Write a protein that binds this ligand. Structure first.
Ligand code: HEM
Ligand SMILES: C[C@@H](c1ncncc1F)[C@](O)(Cn1cncn1)c1ccc(F)cc1F
Length: 424
């Protein structure tokens, strides 16, 4: 795991280490005093050199200049202020119905296979769930991958992400398969953009969401190319890392029996046997919130971020040249024994009440102005999904499944989290 190499270099060579990342030179910064300085200021912005390859993948345009890949502060800020409207409190409150429908459906499908003998890929099951949640909450479209639909669309998503893995971490049938998949995603975008425009044209009123603001941001634009970039941006970002985070948690909780019981007890305490989980109930799931926090310390699907150091400056006694990308890693900091006592132990108590919150040593959703706009969206959906699983099902991991990480397009479980299921 490439990130695990950076960890050893940070522990051995100090808080300022020059590295090769995605065949580019960068400097890894691991002091929490330096994490604050660069991530908490508008002065420092993203380095276009590191995000450049994701904008266009294998000669085919992918993320473009969307909310993530746009490194120029001005172009990013204009669209951020518009897209922000889709992530308001009441905007996310209106998405609670969506979070609930999909979690409930996921559980029943798993409940029908719960015999304690039938292997079920939890990585796939959670991916479909995360995909269904996003497609509706963001675009008002149902993909129903959980019900076995949209098989070609999911394949394309997989291949695209493998194409990402081959692009930044460096045979012909794959190249052919990837190029088609990126077109497919953008073609779906065009179709879903046309469905909303036809709905608006025919007089219909549509509920405010993510799609509404990414259309609003590109108002008076010559073409829909920027809108597709933002469509791709959210289709991927709004399901992928949430799917991996869920998969990591389920995998780890298979070997944490004591933790599962208090999770169940809480689930029994606040949500009981109730089918629909309300918004006010989410904030009462404090221990679940803690367990998910620890899961993100050891297994952040997005390991960190890149800032551009424009002028040669001294960081922690080490002088770094200008035009250099600064690498920041919450994965690395999460596993260093100088920030976290006994780093490799899954201990949810780390984030308990009265316990000092990590000070610039833990940033799964990043920090500052370029932090995750979908943080609350994700935290809401993963509480809802996990709470329902804890209500209804007990999981036993299939013998032979490992507990490792694969550094792919994001960080995700090595094995697809195969489990035999049984009712609680
Ligand atoms: C466990 C869940 C997730 C994690 C850990 C995660 C991780 C992150 C991190 C670390 C960043 C910074 C990226 C960078 O600086 O290169 C980010 C930004 C982003 N996230 Fe998330 N995220 C998740 C959930 C979401 C979801 C559900 C959405 C979509 C609804 C979302 C959409 C975005 C977008 C569009 C950006 C760019 C924001 C901006 O720079 O203005 N993510 N994510
Ligand atoms: C994790 C990461 C990612 N996902 C899929 N392929 C490549 C990636 F880098 C992501 O940050 C998305 N993401 C953010 N919050 C949740 N998910 C991202 C970053 C830059 C980008 F140009 C596109 C992009 F999708």
């Amino acid at each position: 795991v490439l990130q695990d190499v950076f960890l050893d270099w940070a522990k051995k060579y100090g808080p300022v280490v020059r590295v090769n990342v995605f065949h580019k030179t960068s400097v890894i910064v691991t002091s929490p005093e330096s994490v604050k300085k660069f991530l908490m200021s508008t002065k420092y912005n993203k380095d276009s050199k590191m995000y450049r390859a994701l904008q266009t993948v294998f000669g085919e345009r992918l993320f473009g200049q969307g909310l993530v890949s746009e490194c120029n502060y001005e172009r990013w800020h204009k669209q951020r202020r518009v897209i922000d409207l889709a992530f308001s409190r009441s905007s996310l409150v209106s998405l609670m119905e969506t979070f609930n429908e999909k979690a409930e459906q996921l559980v029943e499908i798993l409940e029908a296979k719960a015999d304690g003998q039938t292997p079920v890929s939890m990585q796939d099951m959670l991916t479909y769930t995360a995909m269904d949640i996003l497609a509706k909450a963001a675009f008002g479209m149902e993909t129903s991958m959980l019900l076995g639909a949209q098989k070609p669309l999911s394949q394309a998503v997989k291949l695209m992400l493998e194409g990402i893995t081959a692009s930044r971490n460096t045979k012909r049938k794959q190249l052919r398969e990837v190029r088609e998949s990126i077109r497919f995603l953008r073609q779906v975008g065009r179709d879903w953009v046309q469905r909303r425009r036809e709905a608006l044209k025919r007089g219909e009123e549509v509920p405010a969401d993510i799609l509404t603001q990414i259309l609003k941001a590109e108002e008076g634009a010559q073409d829909d190319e920027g809108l597709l970039d933002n469509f791709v941006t959210f289709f991927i970002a709004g399901h992928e890392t949430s799917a991996n985070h869920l998969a990591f948690t389920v995998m780890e909780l298979s070997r944490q029996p004591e933790i599962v019981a208090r999770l169940q007890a809480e689930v029994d305490e606040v949500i009981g046997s109730k089918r629909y989980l309300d918004f006010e109930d989410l904030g009462r799931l404090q221990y679940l919130s803690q367990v998910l926090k620890e899961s993100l310390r050891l297994y952040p699907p997005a390991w960190g971020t890149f800032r551009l150091l424009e002028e040669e400056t001294l960081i922690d006694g080490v002088r770094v040249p200008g035009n250099t990308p600064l690498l920041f890693s919450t994965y690395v900091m999460g596993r260093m024994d100088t920030y976290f006592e006994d780093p490799l132990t899954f201990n949810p108590d780390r984030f308990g009440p009265g316990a000092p919150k990590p000070r610039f040593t833990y940033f799964p959703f990043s920090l500052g102005h370029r932090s995750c706009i979908g943080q609350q969206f994700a935290q809401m959906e993963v509480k809802v999904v996990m709470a329902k699983l804890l209500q209804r099902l007990e999981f036993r991991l299939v013998p032979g499944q490992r507990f490792g990480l694969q550094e792919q397009a994001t960080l995700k479980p090595l094995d697809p989290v195969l489990c035999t299921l049984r009712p609680r």
